[PDB]
């Protein structure tokens, strides 16, 4: 059989894209989106109906142009989520405005607002994951949201400190970025080529997976952002993996069964005391890669958000 | 006359070193030290008396080896400060353990402890500046310390967000790191050479100086960490400048008067509302250079601290 079919025996496959064409092709359980993917999806011709629909709905909700752009942008993200949920049995991840990454209160409010839009469309919370950046503020926001029945996807996770804080907050799922970790080492270290087993991103996710299962944490571990199928195969066994369509295609066109790589067969160990903010900050900042990548990822998503509001603005 | 003598007309000269030999040579008003400089100074033969003295004093204060290393390390820093105060009419800056940079409570406690040691030696607070890293936690610590009569030197300042928060907290002085800003651009940008007037570090300090005088803030602006005399000359007029002995020597051996570069001749403007933590975090992290350099500076100072404790340990 093909690699994709073989991977499904050990890992839940998730599609990382806002394009429904991929859902039909690979039949993933869940789908993940992001500001960047929403922006690209907005270019898709058949998605024009979703945009006009969002704009029309916005104008019917208020007469203030400022508020219309926000309602339009949020409604578009939800409309795309709605089309995807018609093709996948699992969940859709929709990301909150990245400009709110360091504001717990604003992030909680935005998350509830997005949930409100999905609920108004008749979709229950069990089909959704609110995606937020794994800053200390985002983690604190998610801890609160989970208690209120809103499941979260903690993304842009790079340091072990972030992984630990997320597990301790009891979030539903985390999204460590394998590929971007590789990018940092390629650009800041002497070594420019890595064997799958030595790929820094792979090593990072493997360690997080071990720490999570070893302590009985229920948080789902979903590796994301890949650079090659090598990283994916080396993580076979991870709870879930969200993969871009291009890599999904490569796996499906590859023959040969693969073997499970990630597993924890021991007994559960006792959990330590919770990490405090001060300890979190010290440990996260001890990681040069994580320091750079977390801040950068937030900057980029914020820009994608602004570009999307721009596009929507010229339609009001 | 020489450049050094000429600079003194516009700017207060401060020596950046723990070596008293420099104090006698350049007669600076103040002197600044740091973990790294304390470590190097510990190598100076004539400083052996200061080390043994610190160790002896520590053993007389407690019988616990753990506490002795801490008392010894702190007492050494203070002993060096004491030798320097005999040669300078101004203040000495002594830095708190960098491992406490993200802990407000612990930083306040450490600062008071160092102040206690200076007071026990008969030195009043007006001759001292407690040096802390300009993280949000360090700024909050300094705001509190200033209210209690303890003046602070907010160092490792890189972003405008840090500069603004420091002024709003009413700290006595800030130490923006000119040279390290240049290092970042040389290593992460295409351009590897800069004219003094276009040096990123120089531009950064000039903008901070303008913002401070423009709004009537009393916080002293002291540029630090230089790479060449060009950066120094381009900042003539800055309240103070702390310079390494090697650059102090270059200025003294250079002939030719210099002209004032930094000045604010307008009227004071109204101050805006205070920046909040969320806004601070967003703005600081918008600066790739500041993100990298702040975290890095803290990591290095922490290591210097550990090395110093090592050295002291092998003497107990």
Curated annotation (Swiss-Prot), chains A, B:
InterPro entries: Aldolase_TIM, TAL/FSA, Transaldolase_1, Transaldolase_AS
pH dependence: Optimum pH is between 8.5 and 9.5.
UniProt keyword annotations, A-Z: Cytoplasm, Pentose shunt, Schiff base, Transferase
Subcellular location, principal: cytoplasm
Keyword Cytoplasm: yes
Protein activity control: Inhibited by Tris-HCl and phosphate buffer. Also competitively inhibited by sugars with L configuration at C2, such as D-arabinose-5-phosphate and L-glyceraldehyde.
EC id: 2.2.1.2
Localization terms from the record: Cytoplasm
A Gene Ontology cellular-component term: cytosol
SUPFAM superfamilies: Aldolase
Entry similarity comment: Belongs to the transaldolase family. Type 1 subfamily.
Function: Transaldolase is important for the balance of metabolites in the pentose-phosphate pathway.
Self-association state and partner proteins as the record states: Homodimer.
Protein's name according to its UniProt entry: Transaldolase B
Organism: Escherichia coli (strain K12)
Gene designation: talB
């Amino acid at each position: 059989t093909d690699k994709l079919t073989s991977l499904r025996q050990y890992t839940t496959v998730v599609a990382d894209t806002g394009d429904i064409a991929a859902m039909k092709l690979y039949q993933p359980q869940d789908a993940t989106t992001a500001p960047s993917l929403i922006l690209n999806a907005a270019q898709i011709p058949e998605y024009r109906k979703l945009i006009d629909d969002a704009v029309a709905w916005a104008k019917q909700q208020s007469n203030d142009r400022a508020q219309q752009i926000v309602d339009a942008t949020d409604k578009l993200a939800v409309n795309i989520g709605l089309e995807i949920l018609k093709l996948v049995p699992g969940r859709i991840s929709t990301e909150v405005d990245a400009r709110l990454s360091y504001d717990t209160e604003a992030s909680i409010a935005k998350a509830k607002r997005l949930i409100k839009l999905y609920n108004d469309a008749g979709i229950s919370n069990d089909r959704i994951l609110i995606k937020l950046a794994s800053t200390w503020q985002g983690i604190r926001a998610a801890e609160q949201l989970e208690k209120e029945g809103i499941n979260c996807n903690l993304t842009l996770l790079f340091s072990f400190a972030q992984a630990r804080a997320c597990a301790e907050a009891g979030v539903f799922l985390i999204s460590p970025f394998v590929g971007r970790i590789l990018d940092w080492y390629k650009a800041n270290t002497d070594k420019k080529e890595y064997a799958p087993a030595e790929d820094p991103g792979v090593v990072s996710v493997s360690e997080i997976y071990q720490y999570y299962k070893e302590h009985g944490y229920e948080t789902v571990v979903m590796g994301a952002s890949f650079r090659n199928i090598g990283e994916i195969l080396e993580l076979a066994g991870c709870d879930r993996l969200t993969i871009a369509p291009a890599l999904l295609k490569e796996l499906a066109e590859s023959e040969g069964a693969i073997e499970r790589k990630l597993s924890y067969t021991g007994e559960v160990k006792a959990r330590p005391a919770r990490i405090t903010e001060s300890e979190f900050l010290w440990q996260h900042n001890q990681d040069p890669m994580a320091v750079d990548k977390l801040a950068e990822g937030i900057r980029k998503f914020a820009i994608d958000q602004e570009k999307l509001e721009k596009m929507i603005g010229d339609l009001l």
